Design a protein around this ligand. Structure first.
Ligand SMILES: [Cl-]
Ligand SMILES: [Cl-]
Ligand code: NA
Length: 129
């Protein structure tokens, strides 16, 4: 599924991401835009052989099992394919574990390089929330 901007903002808010660990909703929408272009089916392969999955591009070396990343962990205890669903629940629940692990949203390279320190509230302007 390819979400619209405000549709994704509303879904993320319902799943408890607004101000989660202090990150306002616009941060999460900005991250999803530049990680996946709001596409739940996005996948991208990394040089180390791991793969990033879904709307928030969660990596198989640490967070999910895809059966082809040897020596990796599965800290969210899910198959990586569950992160590609049109239902974002699994992605949100795993993202909550990632953002809580000490490094905040710096875990997402596109957030660090394209959202951090910008007016992220612009990403939810005009939306009925
Ligand atoms: Cl915001
Ligand atoms: Cl933080
Ligand atoms: Na893994």
């Amino acid at each position: 599924k390819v979400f619209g901007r405000c549709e994704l903002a509303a879904a993320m808010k319902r799943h408890g991401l607004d101000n989660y660990r202090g990150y306002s909703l616009g941060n999460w929408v900005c991250a999803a835009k530049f990680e996946s272009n709001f596409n739940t089916q996005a996948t991208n392969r990394n040089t180390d052989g791991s793969t990033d999955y879904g709307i928030l591009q969660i990596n198989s070396r640490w967070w999910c099992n895809d059966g082809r990343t040897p020596g990796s962990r599965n800290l969210c205890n899910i198959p990586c394919s569950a992160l590609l669903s049109s239902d974002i629940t699994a992605s949100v629940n795993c993202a909550k574990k990632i953002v809580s692990d000490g490094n905040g949203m710096n875990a997402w390279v596109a957030w660090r390089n394209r959202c951090k320190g910008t007016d992220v509230q612009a990403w939810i302007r005009g939306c009925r929330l």
